[PDB]
Chains A and B, each alone.
Chain A
């Protein structure tokens, strides 16, 4: 079990998403299966420590998003390209 909290995003785009990495969050997306894609945001430090462990990428994860649990796999991950950080994670629904 790897639990994550989130929030749905009000804003989006370059200006909005750069303000998130100023505030120690970062943006990600949940797509896949049937539904509309969902835009979410995550505490950076939480999910940095989790993705250290290589079970992050094998296992099924559990994103809480306004009460509703969702079960998702880590499909893709953009890193910031020298400092050890994260700029975005794609979460396919399983």
Chain B
């Protein structure tokens, strides 16, 4: 479960999530799972999806994870008449914009890798596509 070792600040603003992604190209590998929509991967989601594609290649290959959950997210506990400060940090997220590559693979063929990233896609909340590397 991914989570920075230490930060400056425990808690962070909510922010927004507008605009398109940096990190659009498949650099590290041959293939990749590009996002098409727009949301947050939790850290549990990112892991569940790695364990799908890892299982599915039988450990051939290499897998890179391009996104990291570094925004923290608070919840108030149950019954909390509002106010009395900001809540505790429950869990961590990456924010995803349309066009971010999330996973990359090489050291398998395009038969198998399509099936691996289909099995990951079912664990993630955002709509995704398969991409191959472009030479320029």
Of the residues A54, A57, A77, A82, contact of B34 by C-beta under 8 Å: A82
> With A82-B34, A82-B36 in contact, is A77–B99 under 8 Å at CB?
no
Interface size grouping (class) on chain A:
under 10
In the bound complex, residues from chain A placing their C-beta under 8 Å from that of B129 are 82
Min C-beta distance of B115 to chain A, whole Å: 21
Contact: B135 with A79, CB < 8 Å? no
A81 to B26: give the CA distance in the assembly, Å. Answer: 12
Interface residues of B (CB under 8 A from A): 20-21, 24, 34-36, 98-99, 129, 134-136
Interface residues of A (CB under 8 A from B): 54, 57, 74, 76-77, 79, 81-82
A39 to B134: give the CA distance in the assembly, Å. Answer: 25
Contact sample, A vs B, 19 pairs, CB 8 Å cutoff: A54-B135, A57-B135, A57-B136, A74-B136, A76-B136, A77-B136, A79-B24, A79-B134, A81-B20, A81-B21, A81-B24, A81-B98, A81-B99, A82-B34, A82-B35, A82-B36, A82-B98, A82-B99, A82-B129
Q: Which of A57, A74, A82: most chain B CB closer than 10 A?
A: A82
Identity of the chain B residue whose Cβ is nearest the Cβ of A57 in the assembled complex: B136
Identity of the chain B residue whose Cβ is nearest the Cβ of A77 in the assembled complex: B136
In the bound complex, residues from chain B placing their C-beta under 8 Å from that of A54 are 135
In the bound complex, residues from chain B placing their C-beta under 8 Å from that of A74 are 136
Identity of the chain B residue whose Cβ is nearest the Cβ of A80 in the assembled complex: B99
In the bound complex, residues from chain A placing their C-beta under 8 Å from that of B24 are 79, 81
A21 to B129: give the CA distance in the assembly, Å. Answer: 22
In the bound complex, residues from chain A placing their C-beta under 8 Å from that of B36 are 82
In the bound complex, residues from chain A placing their C-beta under 8 Å from that of B134 are 79
Min C-beta distance of B134 to chain A, whole Å: 8
The 8 residue pairs across chains A and B that have the minimum distance between CB atoms:
A81-B99, A81-B24, A82-B99, A57-B136, A82-B36, A54-B135, A82-B98, A81-B20
